Coordinates of C-alpha atoms in Angstrom, one line a residue:
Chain A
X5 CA 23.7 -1.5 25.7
X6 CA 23.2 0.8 23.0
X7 CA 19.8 2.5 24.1
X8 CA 21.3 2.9 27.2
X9 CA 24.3 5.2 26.0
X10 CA 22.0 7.2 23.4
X11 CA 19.6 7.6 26.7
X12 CA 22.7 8.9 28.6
X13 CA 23.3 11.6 26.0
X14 CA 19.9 13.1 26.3
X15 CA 18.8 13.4 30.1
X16 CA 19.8 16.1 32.3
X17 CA 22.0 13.8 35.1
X18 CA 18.6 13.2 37.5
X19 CA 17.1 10.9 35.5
X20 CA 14.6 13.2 33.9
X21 CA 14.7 14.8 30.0
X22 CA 14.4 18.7 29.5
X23 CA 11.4 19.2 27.4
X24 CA 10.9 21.2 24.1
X25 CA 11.9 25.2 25.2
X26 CA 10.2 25.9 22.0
X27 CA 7.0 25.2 19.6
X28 CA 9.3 25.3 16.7
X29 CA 13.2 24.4 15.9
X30 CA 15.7 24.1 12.9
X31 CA 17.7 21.3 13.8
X32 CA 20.0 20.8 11.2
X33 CA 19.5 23.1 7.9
X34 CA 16.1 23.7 6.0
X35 CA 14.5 20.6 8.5
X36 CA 12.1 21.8 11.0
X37 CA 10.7 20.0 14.0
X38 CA 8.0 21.0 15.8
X39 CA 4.6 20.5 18.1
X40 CA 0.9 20.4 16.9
X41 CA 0.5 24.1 17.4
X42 CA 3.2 25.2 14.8
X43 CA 1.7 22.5 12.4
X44 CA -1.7 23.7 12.6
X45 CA -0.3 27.4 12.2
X46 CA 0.0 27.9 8.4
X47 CA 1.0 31.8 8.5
X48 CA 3.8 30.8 10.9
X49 CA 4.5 27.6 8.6
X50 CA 5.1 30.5 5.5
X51 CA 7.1 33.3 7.5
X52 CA 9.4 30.0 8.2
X53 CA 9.2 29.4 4.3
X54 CA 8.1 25.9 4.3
X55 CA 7.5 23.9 1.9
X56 CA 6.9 20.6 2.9
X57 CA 5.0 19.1 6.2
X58 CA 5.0 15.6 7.7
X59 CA 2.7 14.8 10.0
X60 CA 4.3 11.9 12.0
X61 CA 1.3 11.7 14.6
X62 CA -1.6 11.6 12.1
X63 CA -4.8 10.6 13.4
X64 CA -7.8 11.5 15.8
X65 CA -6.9 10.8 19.7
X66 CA -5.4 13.3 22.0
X67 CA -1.8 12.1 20.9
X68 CA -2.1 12.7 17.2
X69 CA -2.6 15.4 14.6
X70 CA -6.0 15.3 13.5
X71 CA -4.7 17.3 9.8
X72 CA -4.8 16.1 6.5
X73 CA -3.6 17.4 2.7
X74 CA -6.9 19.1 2.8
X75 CA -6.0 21.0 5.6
X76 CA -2.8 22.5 3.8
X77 CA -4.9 22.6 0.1
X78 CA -3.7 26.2 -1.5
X79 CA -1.4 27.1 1.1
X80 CA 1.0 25.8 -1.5
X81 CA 2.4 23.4 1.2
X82 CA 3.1 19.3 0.5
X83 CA 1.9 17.4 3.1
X84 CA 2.3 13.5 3.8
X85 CA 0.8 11.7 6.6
X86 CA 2.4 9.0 9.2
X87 CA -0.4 7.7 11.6
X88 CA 2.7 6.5 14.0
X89 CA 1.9 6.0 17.7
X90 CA 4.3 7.1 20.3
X91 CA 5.3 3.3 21.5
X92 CA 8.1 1.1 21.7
X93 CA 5.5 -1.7 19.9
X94 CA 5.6 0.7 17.0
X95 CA 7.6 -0.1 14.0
X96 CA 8.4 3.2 13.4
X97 CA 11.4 2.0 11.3
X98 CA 8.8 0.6 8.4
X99 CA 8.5 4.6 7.5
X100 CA 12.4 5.3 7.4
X101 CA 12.9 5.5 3.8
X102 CA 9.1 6.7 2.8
X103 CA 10.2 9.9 5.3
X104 CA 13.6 9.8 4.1
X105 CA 12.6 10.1 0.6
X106 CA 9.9 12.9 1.4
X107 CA 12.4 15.0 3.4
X108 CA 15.2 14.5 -0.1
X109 CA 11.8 15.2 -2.2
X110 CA 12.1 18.3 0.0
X111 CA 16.0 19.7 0.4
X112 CA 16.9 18.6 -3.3
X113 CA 15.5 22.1 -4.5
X114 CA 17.4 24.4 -2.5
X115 CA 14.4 26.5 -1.3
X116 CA 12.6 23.6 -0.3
X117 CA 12.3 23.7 4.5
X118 CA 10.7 20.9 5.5
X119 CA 9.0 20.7 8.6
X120 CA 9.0 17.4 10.6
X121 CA 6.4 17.3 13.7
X122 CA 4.7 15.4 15.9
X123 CA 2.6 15.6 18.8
X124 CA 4.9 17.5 20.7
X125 CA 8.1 16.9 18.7
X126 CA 9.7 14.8 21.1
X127 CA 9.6 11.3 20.0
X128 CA 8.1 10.5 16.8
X129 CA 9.5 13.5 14.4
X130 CA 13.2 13.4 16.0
X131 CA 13.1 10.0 15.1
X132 CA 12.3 10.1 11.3
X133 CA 15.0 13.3 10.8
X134 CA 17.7 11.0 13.1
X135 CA 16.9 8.5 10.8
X136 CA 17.2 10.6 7.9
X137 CA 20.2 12.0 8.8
X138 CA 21.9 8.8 9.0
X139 CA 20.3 7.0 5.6
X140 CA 20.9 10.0 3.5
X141 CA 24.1 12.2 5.0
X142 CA 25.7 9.5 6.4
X143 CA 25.5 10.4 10.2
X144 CA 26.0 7.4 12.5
X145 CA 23.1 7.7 15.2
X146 CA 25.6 9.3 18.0
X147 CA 26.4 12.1 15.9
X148 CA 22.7 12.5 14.1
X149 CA 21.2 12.3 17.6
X150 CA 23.3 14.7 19.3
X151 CA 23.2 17.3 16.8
X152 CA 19.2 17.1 16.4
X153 CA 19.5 17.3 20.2
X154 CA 22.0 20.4 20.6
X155 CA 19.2 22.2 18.7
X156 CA 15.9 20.9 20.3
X157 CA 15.2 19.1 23.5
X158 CA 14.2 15.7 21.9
X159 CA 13.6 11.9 23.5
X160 CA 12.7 9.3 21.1
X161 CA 11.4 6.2 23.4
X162 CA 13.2 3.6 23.6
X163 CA 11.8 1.0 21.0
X164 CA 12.6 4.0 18.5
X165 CA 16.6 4.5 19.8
X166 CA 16.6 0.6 19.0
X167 CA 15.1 0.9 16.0
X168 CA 18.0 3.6 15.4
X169 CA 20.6 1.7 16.5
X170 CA 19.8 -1.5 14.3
X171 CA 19.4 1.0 11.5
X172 CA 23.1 2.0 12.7
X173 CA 24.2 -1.5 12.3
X174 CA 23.3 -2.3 8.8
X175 CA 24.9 1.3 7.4
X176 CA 27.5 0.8 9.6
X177 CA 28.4 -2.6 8.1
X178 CA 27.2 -1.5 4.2
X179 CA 29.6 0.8 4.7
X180 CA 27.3 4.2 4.2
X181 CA 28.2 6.3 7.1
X182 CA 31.2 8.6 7.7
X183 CA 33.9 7.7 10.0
Chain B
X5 CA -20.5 10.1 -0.1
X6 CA -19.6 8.4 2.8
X7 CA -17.0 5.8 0.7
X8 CA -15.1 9.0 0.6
X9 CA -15.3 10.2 4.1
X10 CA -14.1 6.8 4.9
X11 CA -10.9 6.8 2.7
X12 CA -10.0 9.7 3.7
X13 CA -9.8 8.8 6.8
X14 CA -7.5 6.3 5.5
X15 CA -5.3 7.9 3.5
X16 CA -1.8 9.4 4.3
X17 CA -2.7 13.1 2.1
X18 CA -0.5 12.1 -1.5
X19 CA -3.4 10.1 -2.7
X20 CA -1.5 6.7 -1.0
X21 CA -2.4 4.2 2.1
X22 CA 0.3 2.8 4.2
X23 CA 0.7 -0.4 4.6
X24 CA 1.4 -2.2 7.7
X25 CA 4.2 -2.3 9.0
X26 CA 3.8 -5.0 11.7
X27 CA 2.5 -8.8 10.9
X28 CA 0.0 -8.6 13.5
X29 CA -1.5 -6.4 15.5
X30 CA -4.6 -6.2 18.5
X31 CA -6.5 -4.0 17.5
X32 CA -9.0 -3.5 19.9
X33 CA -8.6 -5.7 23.5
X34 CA -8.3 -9.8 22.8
X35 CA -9.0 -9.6 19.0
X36 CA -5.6 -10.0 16.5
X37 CA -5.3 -8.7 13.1
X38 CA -2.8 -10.0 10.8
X39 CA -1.4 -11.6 7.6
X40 CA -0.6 -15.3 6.3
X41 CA 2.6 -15.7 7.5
X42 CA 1.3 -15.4 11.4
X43 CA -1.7 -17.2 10.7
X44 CA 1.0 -20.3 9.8
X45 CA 2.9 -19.9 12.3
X46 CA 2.0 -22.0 15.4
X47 CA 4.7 -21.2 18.1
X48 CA 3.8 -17.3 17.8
X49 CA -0.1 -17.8 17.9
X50 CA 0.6 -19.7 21.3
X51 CA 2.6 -17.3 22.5
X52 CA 0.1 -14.4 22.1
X53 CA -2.5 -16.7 23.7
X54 CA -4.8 -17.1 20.5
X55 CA -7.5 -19.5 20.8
X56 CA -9.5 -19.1 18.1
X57 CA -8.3 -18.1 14.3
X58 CA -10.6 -16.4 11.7
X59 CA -9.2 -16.8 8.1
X60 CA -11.0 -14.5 6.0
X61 CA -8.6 -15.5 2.8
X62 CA -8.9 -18.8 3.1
X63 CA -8.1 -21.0 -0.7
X64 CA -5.6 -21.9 -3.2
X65 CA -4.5 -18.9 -4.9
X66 CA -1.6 -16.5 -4.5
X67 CA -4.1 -13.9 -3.2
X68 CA -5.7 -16.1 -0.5
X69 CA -4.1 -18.6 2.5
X70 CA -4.0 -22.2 1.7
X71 CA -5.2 -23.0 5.8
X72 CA -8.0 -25.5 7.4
X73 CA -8.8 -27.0 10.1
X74 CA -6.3 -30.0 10.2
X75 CA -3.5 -27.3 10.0
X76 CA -4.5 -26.3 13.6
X77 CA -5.3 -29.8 14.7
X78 CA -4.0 -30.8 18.4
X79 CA -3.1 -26.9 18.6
X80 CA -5.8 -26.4 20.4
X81 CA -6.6 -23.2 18.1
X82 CA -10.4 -23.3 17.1
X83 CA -10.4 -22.4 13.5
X84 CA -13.3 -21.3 10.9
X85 CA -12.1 -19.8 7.5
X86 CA -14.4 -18.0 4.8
X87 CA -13.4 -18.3 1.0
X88 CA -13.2 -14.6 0.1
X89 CA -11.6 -12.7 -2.6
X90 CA -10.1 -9.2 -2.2
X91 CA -12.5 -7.4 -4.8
X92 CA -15.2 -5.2 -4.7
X93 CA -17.5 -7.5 -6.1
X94 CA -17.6 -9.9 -3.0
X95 CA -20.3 -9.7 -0.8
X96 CA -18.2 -9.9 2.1
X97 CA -21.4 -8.7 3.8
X98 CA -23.3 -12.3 3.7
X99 CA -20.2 -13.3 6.0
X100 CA -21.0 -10.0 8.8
X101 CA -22.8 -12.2 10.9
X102 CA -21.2 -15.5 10.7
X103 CA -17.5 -13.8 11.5
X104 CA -19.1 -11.5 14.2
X105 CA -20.7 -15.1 15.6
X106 CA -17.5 -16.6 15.5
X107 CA -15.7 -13.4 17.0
X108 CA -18.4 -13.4 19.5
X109 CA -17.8 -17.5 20.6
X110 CA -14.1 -15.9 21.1
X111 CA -14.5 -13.3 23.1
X112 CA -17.5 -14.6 25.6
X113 CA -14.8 -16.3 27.3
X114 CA -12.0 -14.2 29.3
X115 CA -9.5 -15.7 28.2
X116 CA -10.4 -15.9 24.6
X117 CA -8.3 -14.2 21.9
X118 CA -9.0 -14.4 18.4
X119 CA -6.7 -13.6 15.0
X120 CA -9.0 -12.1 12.4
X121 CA -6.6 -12.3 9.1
X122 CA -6.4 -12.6 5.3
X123 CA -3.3 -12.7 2.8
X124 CA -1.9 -8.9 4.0
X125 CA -4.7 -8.4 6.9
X126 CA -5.3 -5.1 5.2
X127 CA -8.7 -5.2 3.5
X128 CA -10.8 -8.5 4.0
X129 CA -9.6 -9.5 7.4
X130 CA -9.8 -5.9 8.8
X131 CA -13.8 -5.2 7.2
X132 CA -14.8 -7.9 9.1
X133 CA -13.8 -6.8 12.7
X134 CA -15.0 -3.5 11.9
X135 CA -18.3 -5.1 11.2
X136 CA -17.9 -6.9 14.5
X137 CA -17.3 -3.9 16.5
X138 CA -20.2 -2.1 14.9
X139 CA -22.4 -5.2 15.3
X140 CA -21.9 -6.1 18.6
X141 CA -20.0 -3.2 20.5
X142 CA -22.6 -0.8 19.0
X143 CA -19.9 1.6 17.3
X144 CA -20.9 3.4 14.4
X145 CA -18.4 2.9 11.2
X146 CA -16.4 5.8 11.7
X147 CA -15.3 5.3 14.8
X148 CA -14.8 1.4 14.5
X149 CA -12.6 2.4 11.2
X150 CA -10.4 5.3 13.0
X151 CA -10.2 2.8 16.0
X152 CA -9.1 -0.4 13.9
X153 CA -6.7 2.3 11.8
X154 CA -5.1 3.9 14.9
X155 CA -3.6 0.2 15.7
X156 CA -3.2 -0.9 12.1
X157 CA -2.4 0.2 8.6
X158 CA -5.1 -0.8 7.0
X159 CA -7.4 -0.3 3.7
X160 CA -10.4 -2.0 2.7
X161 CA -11.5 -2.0 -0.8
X162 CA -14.0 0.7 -2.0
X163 CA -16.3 -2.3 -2.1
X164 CA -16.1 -3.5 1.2
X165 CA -16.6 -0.1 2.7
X166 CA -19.5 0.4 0.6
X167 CA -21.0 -2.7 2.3
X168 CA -20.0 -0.9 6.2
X169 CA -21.9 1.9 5.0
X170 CA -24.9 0.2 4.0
X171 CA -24.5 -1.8 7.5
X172 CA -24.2 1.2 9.7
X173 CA -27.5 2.7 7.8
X174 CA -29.2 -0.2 9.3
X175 CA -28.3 -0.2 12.3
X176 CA -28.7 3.4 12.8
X177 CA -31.9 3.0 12.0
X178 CA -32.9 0.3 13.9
X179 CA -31.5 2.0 17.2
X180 CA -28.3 -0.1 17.8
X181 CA -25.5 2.2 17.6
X182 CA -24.0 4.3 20.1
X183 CA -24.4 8.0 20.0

């Protein structure tokens, strides 16, 4: 089982999963992901140089990110929305290419940084760039997975690894990922 | 204007609405939003326990669901269906209190669970429950939209949420909404 061997590549041997060591990380270049805090920080957001933000927790309960465009209106930052919920019930997969296409809308200028968050950029976020990574640099989900996790302390839950694996699957078979 | 508030709410901050990216969803404990293809399919209403089905869609067109009763005879699904178009011309509102009835017969029993849909359970199927919850569960519109929203993509028609408004104004007034 897939999940399974994605799971074993991201605990820490006693069962457990290190958490985020900081607010904010570049995982791979010019993409970003990151906690509520560093969302809701827009001076940070500009030292970083970032153009673009999408919120993958959007919404109002003590697990989302209660912004909005507004929010980011004449910081000079693009913002999109995902109103995901941290849950294996959540087809999070239905917002693979509308975040892959934001994050290329992003790095196809070369001074374009996008920032990916979530909640606590954890689950959600990692998820969209993993996916990213594999739809649009043709990463299968072992490599895109452990290089987003070399650089932050990540854990998608498991219907999201799933959801990555099938993902894997049909690119695998298409023939869009590098061997 | 409180059409406004409401959308954006709604909206994912590029001027767009998700859509949803599940068939079905509960949305709030025992009551089932979702589109035409659920609402025909038997096996999976059984499954999920449904005893009672709500088509708010319900005709011959492309933009409604072409159900009635004797499509859910010897199922033992209870079924009522209202003929309404998708426009913000229908007075969906002349239907608040015969759906939040009908929801109302559902959910009296323990064990009921009711599937409110229309064609994409996104606009017409979705107003309704939130009329329900504001109606009987006393929650003003706001916080029956965000609720509804958290567990569905969903967007009513300008219309439709013209019609909540004018809703929760009365029953603000006549004492009957949570604070």
């Amino acid at each position: 089982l897939s999940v399974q061997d994605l799971n074993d590549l991201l605990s820490d041997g006693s069962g457990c999963y290190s958490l985020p060591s900081q607010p904010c990380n570049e995982v791979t270049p010019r993409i970003y992901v990151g906690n509520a805090s560093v969302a809701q920080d827009i001076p940070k957001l500009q030292k970083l140089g970032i153009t673009h933000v999408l919120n993958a927790a959007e919404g109002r309960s003590f697990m989302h990110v209660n912004t909005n465009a507004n929010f980011y209106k004449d910081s000079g930052i693009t913002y999109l929305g995902i109103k995901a919920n941290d849950t294996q019930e959540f087809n999070l997969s239905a917002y693979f290419e509308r975040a892959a296409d934001f994050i290329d809308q992003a790095l196809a200028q070369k001074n374009g940084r996008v920032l990916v968050h979530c909640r606590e950029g954890y689950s959600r976020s990692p998820t969209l760039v993993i996916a990213y990574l594999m739809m649009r640099q043709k990463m299968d989900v072992k490599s895109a997975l452990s290089i987003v996790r070399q650089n932050r302390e990540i854990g998608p839950n498991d219907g999201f690894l799933a959801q990555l694996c099938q993902l894997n699957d049909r690119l695998a078979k298409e023939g869009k990922l590098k061997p």
